[PDB]
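Hi there. Long-time user, first ticket. I'm pasting a complex I've been working with (about 442 residues overall). I'd like to know whether the download I got is complete or cut off, because the file seemed smaller than I expected. Thanks.
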Amino acid sequence: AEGDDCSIEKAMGDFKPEEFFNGTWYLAHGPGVTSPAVCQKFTTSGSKGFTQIVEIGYNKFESNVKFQCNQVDNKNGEQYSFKCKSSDNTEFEADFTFISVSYDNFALVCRSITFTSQPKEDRYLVFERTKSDTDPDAKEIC
Amino acid sequence: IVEGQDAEVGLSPWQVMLFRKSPQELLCGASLISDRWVLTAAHCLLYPPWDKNFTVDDLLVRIGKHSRTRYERKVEKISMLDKIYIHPRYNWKENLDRDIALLKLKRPIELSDYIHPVCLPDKQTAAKLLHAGFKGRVTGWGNRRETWTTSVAEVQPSVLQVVNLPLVERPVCKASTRIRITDNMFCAGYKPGEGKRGDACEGDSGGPFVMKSPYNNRWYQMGIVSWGEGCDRDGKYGFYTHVFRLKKWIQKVIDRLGS
Amino acid sequence: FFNEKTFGAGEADCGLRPLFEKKQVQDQTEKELFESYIEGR
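Hi, the file is complete. Here it is re-exported in full:
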């Protein structure tokens, strides 16, 4: 939200990237919101790590769009940056600063999304390992 | 909590959880006093004997919870601290005297049905309610028993627990220990002669000891889970930080900006 | 006792639970607290 700055944050250090970039994580922007859903497939520049992040409630995304994100070398300082491209050819960069994470439960993360359009946007998000029922099954959306 | 029961959802919307960023681990309980101030015990942050010395950058507060290990999307809010204020006179070498800390959130949390501040005792409220015999309530995700045979898992609960304990007279509290009791603390629990029992235990150290006022129907925090010798031992009581006694100090660190 | 500038909101409406007091509902164990106010003469 306006005031948050992932740039001046501090990553968790003991973060093992491959325990995270593996599997499916569900991310809702609020208890209620269930639309739009959008599936993002992440690939870490290294050991593949085809992670499916199902994001829900983000008004900036279209409901029937898929994103293919590939890891880049940008933002070397304790930050994992990804360039995402979509079915509608949207494109934006997403940087993740991992704050706290239990690779099998949930993870608090500071995210900076930079759409080619209006750049700079920081928000503390929580990635869940368990689907909150109302969430679309990753298999359906991805 | 020893000898308590599962708390209903929303039982105490002021129950905050002190959580460590990495590794993820429940550190203590706390209490929401306003939308940007949370109260807890000093030893949850500063306690050299155990190597405890947390900073605003090591923790985060999870408010609105019910389950202890689970992230609850519909009710939980995660917040960060901007400042930690620990009492200058906090005595950790001796008896954990003035075991109190005040934490400031970076930005005010969003109140809801699951998040709401408890009242702080008044001069009249403390007077009419702090009487040996009257009960109070303690809530927490700490251990359900002092020990375990195989693993701590056996004693760790899944949801927030609730136990109601009566206030005990100071002379009894003083006669139960060979440790120095000070005015900044009070004890509660069942006397051995009463067919009941219950106590706070490891993992509950910041949670509020509250009492509901018969006069105005409001919940006041009278104490803070501080210490004891074991948990639920016969002839032993739990000692809570006398919140009302350190009321003037609280006001002193809160009101530090143009007022 | 506290301002509101530094303290924040909450005090004027503290101690009343939205799901209980504000909804005229009482939890499973409140009675235990009220009876502890009995006072024998």
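A couple of notes from our side: The radius of gyration of chain C is 15 Å. The helical segments of chain C are 30-35.
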